[PDB]
Design a protein around this ligand. Sequence first.
Ligand code: 607
Ligand code: CA
Ligand code: CL
Length: 223
Amino acid sequence: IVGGYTCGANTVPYQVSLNSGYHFCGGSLINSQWVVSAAHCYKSGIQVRLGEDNINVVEGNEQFISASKSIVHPSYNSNTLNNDIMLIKLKSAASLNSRVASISLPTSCASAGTQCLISGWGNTKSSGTSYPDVLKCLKAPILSDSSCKSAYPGQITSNMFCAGYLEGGKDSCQGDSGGPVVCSGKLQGIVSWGSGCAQKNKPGVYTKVCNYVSWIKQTIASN
Ligand SMILES: NC(=[NH2+])c1ccc2[nH]c(-c3cc([C@@H](CC(=O)[O-])C(=O)[O-])cc(-c4ccccc4N)c3[O-])nc2c1
Ligand SMILES: [Ca+2]
Ligand SMILES: [Cl-]
């Protein structure tokens, strides 16, 4: 997260870290046995880490559970990153409490101007790599579709939205991918891509979760 702030331990109880010997993507707990992340964060050998703050120290509250299966959206396109969403089922359910809780799926899509909270252990520099130990947060508004399309002409599908600041300085970045964009207490986006991080006129592009609710629900129901 570039230009963000330290969240505070466990203030984002739905945030998860996908780990394969190191943190590679974030994700969101949507129920005690399922997580939502981005399809491009897929790989085998994933361990889901819940209740984390400092990812390099066991401070307590952590639950490390292996993924039983990962379901990448069948229509995911790696070249355009359209349908960049993935569901991960956990081998055993997580014990939910105040430090580990699920976030709700939306009923409606959010509007431009909606303010949301983006979090993750991704890079904090736009020029170079500096990864943090604790979770970083950023408050960012959803931009209008015309501003999004003007910034990424021909690359925005109806399953994406932009959120951020056109002046640069604040954005999500590598390592934040797969994590949550929560607005008014509902999971509205998934960190997906962007051009560099926090560059002027190149905002973050997120997966528009509201378009996948029926799919997420049907898929969980049949697995
Ligand atoms: N500016 C943004 N809002 C933004 C948001 C999420 C991003 N995720 C990534 C991202 C970048 C990479 C690098 C890899 C490298 O330079 O070593 C790449 O391919 O350009 C990789 C991933 C990535 C790809 C597969 C699995 C986990 C990952 N973290 C990113 O999400 N960039 C991002 C940029
Ligand atoms: Ca830890
Ligand atoms: Cl266009």
